[model samples]
Target: AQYEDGKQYTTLEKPVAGAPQVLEFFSFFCPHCYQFEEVLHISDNVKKKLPEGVKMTKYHVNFMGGDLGKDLTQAWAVAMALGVEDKVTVPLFEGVQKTQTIRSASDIRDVFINAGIKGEEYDAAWNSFVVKSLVAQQEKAAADVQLRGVPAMFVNGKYQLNPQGMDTSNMDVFVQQYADTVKYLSEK
Candidate 1:
């Protein structure tokens, strides 16, 4: 019932201002992030457990996929800008992480196209300032946070969840305890 400081979580030196926010840093090419998204369902689980007015934001990092990291970051921004994140997130993860079908950012276009988005729309978004701006934002955030791993979450832009400090023997309990810690942090 107790979440010890420096154990379950750590406080950021410069906390972001405004709102109770849960910021998730993840990479499309990360195997653990794929497992977290598809298998553990941590986002959905934590979303439900969070209190009212708590905003959840997922940022795709640009540190993996080698030369394709930036491309995938822009791809994620495009998906987010087009309001197709719900449709394309899982598919992109599967294509990039599971099936090994997505090799480049252009390859990501196919996933959106298959999900009912027009090729022209995807192209427009790909080159749009909106998408590029999002990519820049994500890149800056990843570097600013100095994130060293995928699937890391920060509560209120200050308290970062430390997976190594928590109980994770069972999958369900792991997610539950994580959600509880997030809920606890969101209120502070």
Candidate 2:
């Protein structure tokens, strides 16, 4: 059973296809998600102890009342496509969430450009079919799961995790469960 008290956790029903898929469904514009970003370092532990054949992804939820015009999401897919996700990820989050100046693709371009993204690579990834497809896939995944809010964790396309609600003093526990769950399920 899911618990906040002890060695218990929420679990999911099914296994992911192909590999153990670890996903964080989040939005850059959500305050709660921004706060939850701190716990992401906990996810960093996954790198050191990642299980064999397990895959991890961060799904940037692109829908939010259309206020952001989905430009940010598109920009994100572009970043991922260009292999600069690591370069611009956190900075993009800070700029978009903190600046309040980005409203369209042009504005997004300016921010990335200033951040040292090359115009050539940027053009290639921007609105490219591959990036578009990836974004669409994320949109579909969110819908399939009936995502209710930001900062939710999805493991192997089934289970969800919560550090704050899980109420563990040590963040390692949740991540360990996630890694172990992925290892066990992948071997099954």
Candidate 3:
């Protein structure tokens, strides 16, 4: 079921198809996810130095929506449908970090423009079949996962880092360790 008021969320489908070496769950508006972006870039670079077959997919968690989140979620679903996950991911992160104004649909669409994604294409995708499919998939996944917060990661679908269980005071260290844990689990 889609996220309803006063109800906890379920997990979405596995964003990655193959056995993901690392599964990153994050929200666009999460401050910690922004900080961890640097860490993820560094980790991605480091993984490149390693052998092949290591894969990581980021899952966007929409746990909060005050109209902004709703619009952002729609944009994200559209991006995923259009096969421009990377294109939208980085810009969406930038939007949440840079924009001081409220995050509305138009605000997010503006971010897409700034990121060089054509407004027409974005609009088309937003109303396309692919976006609808992804939205349904996301809602189903959210229900299955029984999610409660953002910035959660599941390693091999065995180890889970829920938001309430994390130590946010030293987020950098935790994120680094979390990445390391995924690497270790993948190897094992």
Alpha carbon lDDT of each predicted model:
0.85, 0.65, 0.60
lDDT of 1 by residue, 1-188 (tens): 47888988888887766523888988988988988898899999999999977778888887787878778888889887888888998999998877889887668888998999999899988999998888888877777677888889998778899877877789899899889999999888
> Against the true structure, what is every candidate's RMSD?
1.6, 3.8, 7.9
Estimated TM-score for each candidate = 0.94, 0.76, 0.71
The CA lDDT at 116 in model 3 is 79
Candidate 2 pairs with clashing backbones: none
On a 0 to 1 TM-score scale, where does candidate 1 land against the true structure? 0.94
Sort the candidates on lDDT, descending order.
Answer: 1, 2, 3
Worst window of 10 by summed lDDT in candidate 2: 1-10
Each prediction's total of clashing residue pairs, residues at least 3 apart in sequence or on different chains, is 0, 0, 8
Q: Write the per-residue lDDT of candidate 3 for residues 1-188, one digit (tens) a residue.
A: 22221222123354333335555566778877766664445246435443457666556666775667667667778777766776766677776775654467887787777777788888898888888777765555555456576666554554554334334577565555554544544554
Backbone clashes in model 1: 0
Give per-residue CA lDDT, model 2, range 29-120, as digits (tens): 77766655645454466545666566678777866637563777777788777777667766666766777666666777877788788888
Lowest lDDT block of 10, candidate 3? 1-10
Best by TM-score: 1
lDDT computed for candidate 3: 0.60
Residue 5, candidate 1: C-alpha displacement in angstroms:
1.3
